[PDB]
Amino acid sequence: PLNNIVVFGDSLSDNGNLYEYMKHQLPQSPPYFEGRFSNGPVWIERLAASYFPNDPNSHLLDYAFGGAGVSVFFTLRREVNSYLLAHQDKASPDSLFVIWIGANNYLGMPVEVEETLKNVNRGIADSIQRLVDKGAKHILVLNLPDLGRTPAALEFGSVEEMTYFSAQHNNALSNTVDYFKKTYPEVEWLFFDTGSHFDHVIEHASEYGFTNITGTCSFSIVDEITKNSVLKMVASVKPELTESACDGYLFFDLVHPTALAHKIMAEKARLMLDEAGVEFAE
Structure with missing residues (x-):
């Protein structure tokens, strides 16, 4: 079985990382919900909630930063580096790794269409x-x-x-x-x-x-x-x-x-993982 969830992402998965660094000033909450880039918990928070009730935030390692993307406020490589630094360069075998990245690079509307598509992927x-x-x-x-x-x-x-x-x-x-x-x-x-x-x-x-x-x-x-x-x-x-x-x-x-x-x-996402046979416990 799997023990926790590690998500690398951007403003669509951040659970308050930028909010803390910004001293609770961005995203302004309210109307934003406690630093999330929405008016409620983000998708990956709810997913972890369904697996570990009464204490999901002890099974969710959310490295997603608002404004993050592919080398942009923060880079995916550095989100991963952050995890590897704090785990002796070893990705846990019982962890589920999630990568949802790219939207911030494209929404910035850059000048190089194909080179951006290239460097993101x-x-x-x-x-x-x-x-x-x-x-x-x-x-x-x-x-x-x-x-x-x-x-x-x-x-x-x-x-x-x-x-x-x-x-x-x-x-x-x-x-x-x-x-x-x-x-x-x-x-x-x-x-x-x-x-x-x-x-x-x-x-x-x-x-x-x-x-x-x-x-x-x-x-x-x-x-x-x-x-x-x-x-x-x-x-x-x-x-x-x-x-x-x-x-x-x-x-x-x-x-x-x-x-x-x-x-x-x-x-x-929960149904998809249930369909795939992924089990969470401990």
Whole structure:
């Protein structure tokens, strides 16, 4: 069986890491929920909650930093380095490693399309190799949702570029994970097709509880130069203008999903791992 969960990610998986370093000033909470980039617990928190009730945060090693991505506030290599530094360079064999990364590199809307796609997928593949080289036996990799459906892309006309990033990224990542499966069959390889799961929720938004998928719960204002990052967008949130009732919103801010969308993600991920035969105890 497996003892704990180690998640490498960005603002979509951070459980308050940047919030602490920022001295509780970013993300401003409220309207954000205690440093999460949403109005509730993030998906990986709920998933660990379902496995270790009454004390999940003693089984969750969350190294995800807000604004993190592939070499950007923080790099995946450094999240992994942080774990390896604090474990004598040994990846625990009874730990589940989670890598959900890339969204922050693409949402920044860089100038080099293909080179960014290239360096993001190369950075992830490198991270899986390092973890596998240090003894990781259970690795979960998640692909990206259709970023063209974020209010950011819908406001700045980048639906084409963001959807293109999501599809091409998910295709390369699929081939990357297929390589590591045809190379390390001794390692349990787990995959989550976020792209398809989020498209199904979108096409059935009302059935999942959402009444609005284009607007935002909070409110923010950004401009050309400064707007070129997720963290500046989060820093430009106006707490006084955030809606009090956001039941129904799919997006809490210009890119981050609301608390309900994190719960749906965690429940689907739990069922997928239950389908795969992954057991947690101790």
